[PDB]
Design a protein around this ligand. Structure first.
Ligand SMILES: [K+]
Ligand SMILES: [K+]
Ligand SMILES: [K+]
Ligand SMILES: [K+]
Ligand SMILES: [K+]
Ligand code: NA
Ligand SMILES: [Zn+2]
Lengths: 825, 222
């Protein structure tokens, strides 16, 4: 880097000799006397009447003995180093050096100092050393090419430099050229030129001689031809440019849309702890127009950073400060028609981030279960197909389970519908503020008093006292969370207790102070027939093995088809079968590992064998033999070719005597229109079979209002006003009061996104959800069930007394109630 | 007169600290004002990308033919001259449509809003709760008419959900989808009328011509 040192020293000397020229003119007083270095110095005066101008003041300037030598030495070093570079670098051309305009200014401002050595009398001769500052500007430009010390900042700094040189040349030129007439000082000429460049033109000080007038004219032309070139360069940098704090998180997506961004921002910033965080979005695609408008909002302008780049490029991960991020959220693209390709992209992105920043927690959203074991290294992984079908299957067992999970994984204060005149809306919006929290039991004011007591005793009494629902615990010895360990489990101070409550125990410091404001058998302190086995052919790695009701012998693939008759049976539709129970018809496009996660919860060993519901898969495409091999061991699981829009196929399914119809059918530029085909197709069957229970999954929660649409219905139309009011108050649960959602008829997969975002603050949330869905089976962990409250159980007047009876007899823990009212339409 | 660069000179700083103040402050002016100018330029460029009794026109893609047929028929009545038309169309404004909107007969009457009926925010910008009528028109150029009919069914549902007391005027392509928008005040099925007129032309010649002239507002001056 010695070359840059040479130019830096060359730049330093250029500004030094210009400043030394300023020192000269500051100590040069013409009124004392001006001459040719010695004898005959002549005093002079300016006559405005006489047009002739004496050139002796302009030609000759009095130069100190120390001053002339030190500038000559500086000029000699100036001349030596510039020729040192010229001879050092030819680069294939000996000519053209003088035509480029830096040599002519160099030599004309330097070699006069060399020739002044020969003759004493002309040592006091004027040489325009102020023009040398232009070369110093040039010497700065070549420095910018190598070292920064911010891409356009250099041009702006250069623009200021050429402005300074224009001003500097003006002051020295005017002060010296008017030293013959009106004898302007430097300070006055400096103010003279500043008001000239800004075109003010005051006129109080003006050039009174023809040379000075000409200098202003030629200089005004120079300014008007050199400044626009700098302006155009700044314009070029600006147009090409148009195309923070600590504790940030990176959000890696393939395409970012307004729905995904708002879902993340609402959930991420719903916590007070994560308010000092800013979000970096690494998305290869250009920013969406709707996304741009939201980012211009000044709540999100300082918080959300959008970077156009790829996680597979380490340069883009450096711009995102991935090595410093608190967390990484890799989210799959669901709009992509090829989900295997999308899953491959997120696997690579997870691998790319892990390779770049190993000590960065990964939060990966995986589409297909077969690709889940490639990102198993990630701290938190959510498989959409596993949870979607497990929730859809549980809705067939426990109604509105998806609605129950949706509200729990959503961060809310339970303030929705608190002004509503309807009692059910107030209690529904209040109970929706429940969440799942964890606390060390010894540190827990809710459960510390139950030391040495059974889990069910603590769960009941904490609910009876504070209204908290102890659902599970995690022992300090193991890492496994158990839902409802049972009455045999004995509580300890090291256990981490998982409870459902409106507010965190620490955040409930008011009720404990409010507690201080006040200041059935009892639960005990101390406690063809089917085989039962595991499905043989697991379809994918990571499939949690659940003990299920299994056929004694594998069913041949011909017997799994409800359409065609075979050797074993001539039945051609569900009527010829004559099932004892009501059918579950699943209208899916393709049969994969997701549909496997639908059949497993319905065939589990704890599910009643007499209440087993036949499962009819209404597939658009013929299932491959691997899926049939995975489901050939399950009793009363059949498939057929058809769709929800074909009424012939649905009547062939047994829709007449089907208790549930699950529509998972998959089909646009306008985002909300993706569900148009599914919504209308489901609506047609809502009108053909009004009593049928149809469960649907929609891409957008905003479309949940269209599931069972009664246009001539004031009540459902009034719910729009309530939903808009909740949306006015900034509630993230605004779709909540729509009737199809509240009854469990619809859920969106976008809630799974909120579950992943919650895991950044609740590392147990994913495990709890899968434990409820049965997606992961830990020995000694409970399962979600439902019981019907019939008229023989109405002597149990309240929900608390039911909690007592369950905890005293069967040790079951009620999560909540699915309530039904008469709402004639 | 200093900031405007007029510089009259009748009053001027006669002392050096006053002269220096003018110098530094002129430099301050030339370095602080452009920063405000670039922010205005930044706001202006992104910005580039009324009365009572209006009607909203909800389409998927608006072309010059569809717009002029509406404008000619809507404004052929003297009662509907104080009305202005709001077009809610997700697609960007057509080049041919833009030129006609520049015509100052239609500049004050026709507003084009880029948005969806399925977003309530776009229905608030259209003042849907105050509109006199809503016209949901199917896209006939679309190769998939079932999908287009599904889009208009959702748009009718979205407008009915947002503004129940707003008369809907829905244009339906396929007869099988007509009973989903039966709640609308006025529904036209194109396939029903097209084939009924084509069949009547085989019975009564030029029945379609007879219907065409009747449903067109004209003074009989042709
Ligand atoms: K002027
Ligand atoms: K909640
Ligand atoms: K809460
Ligand atoms: K299907
Ligand atoms: K007519
Ligand atoms: Na069969
Ligand atoms: Zn068979």
């Amino acid at each position: 880097r010695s070359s840059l040192r040479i130019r830096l020293f060359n730049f330093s000397l250029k500004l030094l000799t210009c400043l030394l020229y300023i020192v000269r003119v500051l100590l040069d007083d013409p009124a004392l006397g001006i001459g040719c270095w010695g004898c005959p110095k002549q005093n002079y005066s300016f006559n405005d009447s006489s047009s002739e101008i004496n050139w002796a003041p302009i030609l000759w300037v009095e130069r100190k003995m120390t001053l002339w030598a030190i500038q000559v030495i500086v000029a000699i070093i100036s001349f030596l180093e510039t020729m040192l570079l010229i001879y050092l670098s030819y680069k294939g051309n000996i000519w053209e050096q003088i035509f480029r305009v830096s040599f002519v200014l160099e030599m004309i401002n330097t070699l006069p100092f060399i020739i002044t050595i020969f003759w004493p009398p002309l040592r006091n001769l004027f040489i325009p050393v102020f023009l040398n500052c232009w070369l110093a500007k040039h010497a700065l430009e070549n420095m910018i090419n190598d070292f920064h010390r911010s891409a356009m900042f250099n041009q702006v700094l250069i623009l200021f430099c050429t402005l300074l040189c224009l001003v500097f040349t003006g002051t020295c030129g005017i002060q010296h050229l008017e030293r013959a007439g009106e004898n302007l000082s430097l300070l006055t000429s400096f103010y003279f030129c500043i008001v000239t460049f800004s075109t003010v033109g005051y006129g109080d000080v003006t050039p009174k001689i023809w040379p000075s007038q000409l200098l202003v004219v030629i200089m005004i032309c120079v300014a008007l031809v050199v400044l626009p070139l700098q302006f155009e360069e700044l314009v070029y940098l600006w147009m090409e440019r148009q195309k923070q704090t600590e504790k940030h998180v990176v959000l890696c997506v393939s395409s970012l849309k307004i729905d995904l961004l708002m879902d993340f921002l609402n959930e991420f910033y719903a916590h007070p702890r994560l308010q000092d965080y800013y979000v970096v979005i690494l998305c290869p695609t250009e920013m969406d127009v709707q996304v741009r408008r939201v980012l211009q909002i000044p709540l999100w302008s300082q918080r959300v950073i959008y970077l156009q780049g790829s996680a597979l490029k380490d340069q883009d991960l450096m711009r995102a400060k991935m090595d410093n991020g608190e967390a990484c959220f890799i989210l799959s693209s669901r709009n992509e028609v090829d989900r295997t390709a999308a899953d491959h992209q997120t696997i690579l992105r997870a691998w790319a981030v892990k390779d770049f920043a190993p000590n960065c927690p990964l939060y990966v959203q995986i589409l297909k279960p077969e690709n889940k074991f490639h990102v198993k290294f990630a701290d938190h992984v959510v498989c959409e197909e596993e949870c979607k079908y497990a929730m859809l299957a549980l809705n067939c067992i426990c109604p509105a389970t998806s609605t129950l999970i949706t509200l729990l994984v959503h961060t809310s204060r339970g303030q929705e519908g608190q002004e509503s005149p309807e009692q059910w809306q107030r209690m529904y919006g209040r109970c929706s503020g429940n969440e799942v929290y964890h606390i060390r039991m010894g540190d827990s004011k809710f459960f510390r008093e139950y030391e040495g007591k059974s889990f069910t005793y603590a769960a009941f009494h904490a609910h009876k006292k504070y209204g908290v629902c102890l659902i599970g615990l995690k022992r300090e010895d193991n890492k496994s969370i158990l839902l409802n360990p049972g009455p045999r489990h004995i509580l300890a101070a090291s256990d981490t207790c998982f409870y459902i409550n409106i507010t965190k125990e620490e955040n409930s410091a008011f009720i404990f102070k409010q507690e201080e404001k006040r200041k059935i058998a009892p639960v005990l302190e101390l406690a063809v027939e089917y085989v039962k086995g595991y499905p043989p052919n697991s379809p994918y790695i990571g499939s949690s093995p659940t003990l299920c009701h299994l056929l004694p012998v594998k069913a041949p693939f011909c017997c799994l088809r409800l359409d065609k008759g075979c050797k074993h049976n001539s039945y051609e539709d569900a009527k010829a079968y004559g099932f004892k129970n009501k059918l579950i018809i699943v209208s899916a496009e393709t049969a994969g590992n997701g549909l496997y996660n639908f059949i497993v919860p319905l065939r589990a060993y704890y599910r009643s064998r007499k209440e087993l519901n036949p499962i009819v898969l209404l597939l658009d495409n013929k299932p491959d033999h691997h899926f049939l091999e995975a489901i050939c061991c399950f009793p009363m699981v059949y498939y057929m070719e058809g769709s929800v829009d074909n009424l012939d196929s649905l009547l062939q399914c047994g829709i007449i005597y089907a208790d549930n119809l699950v529509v998972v059918d998959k089909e646009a530029e306008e985002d909300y229109m993706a569900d148009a085909k599914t919504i209308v197709n489901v609506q047609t069957m809502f009108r053909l079979f009004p009593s049928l229970s149809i469960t649907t999954e929609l891409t957008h929660p905003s479309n949940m209002r269209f599931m069972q649409f009664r246009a001539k219905d004031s009540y459902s139309l009034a719910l729009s006003k309530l939903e808009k009011r909740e949306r006015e108050n900034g509630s993230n649960l605004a779709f909540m009061f729509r009737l199809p959602f509240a009854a469990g008829r619809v859920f969106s997969i976008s809630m799974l996104d909120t579950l992943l975002y919650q895991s950044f603050v609740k590392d147990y949330m994913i495990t709890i959800t899968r434990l409820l869905l049965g997606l992961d089976t830990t020995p000694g962990s409970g399962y979600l069930c439902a019981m019907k409250i019939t008229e023989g159980d109405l002597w149990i007047r309240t929900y608390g007394r039911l909690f007592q009876k369950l905890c005293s007899s069967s040790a079951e823990i009620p999560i909540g109630i699915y309530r039904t009212e008469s709402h004639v339409f």
